[PDB]
Amino acid sequence: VQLAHHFSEPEITLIIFGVMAGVIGTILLISYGIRRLIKK
Amino acid sequence: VQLAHHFSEPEITLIIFGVMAGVIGTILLISYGIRRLIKK
Structure with missing residues (x-):
């Protein structure tokens, strides 16, 4: 992540x-929702 | 995603x-993704 602006x-x-x-x-x-569906 | 400026x-x-x-x-x-999959 070196961005590309500043001035x-x-x-x-x-x-x-x-x-x-x-x-x-x-x-x-x-x-997060996907994890809840899977998990277990 | 308007970009003409007017809001x-x-x-x-x-x-x-x-x-x-x-x-x-x-x-x-x-x-759109769900539709491609096709719900029901």
Whole structure:
């Protein structure tokens, strides 16, 4: 993870990041649900 | 995933919206995946 920005604050980069973060949270929830289904 | 610009003018408003949008997109993808599998 070497990112690809730093100077100034690209509003698009942060907005994109927020969208990505929401997707990641949903994925994490799905993984937990999948584990519950399996496990045992 | 609109990118033409025309919803949240303010940053936090758009970044927060993007995060919400990402979660929605993930949910849509899951529904599509389920359909490909074919439920019932």
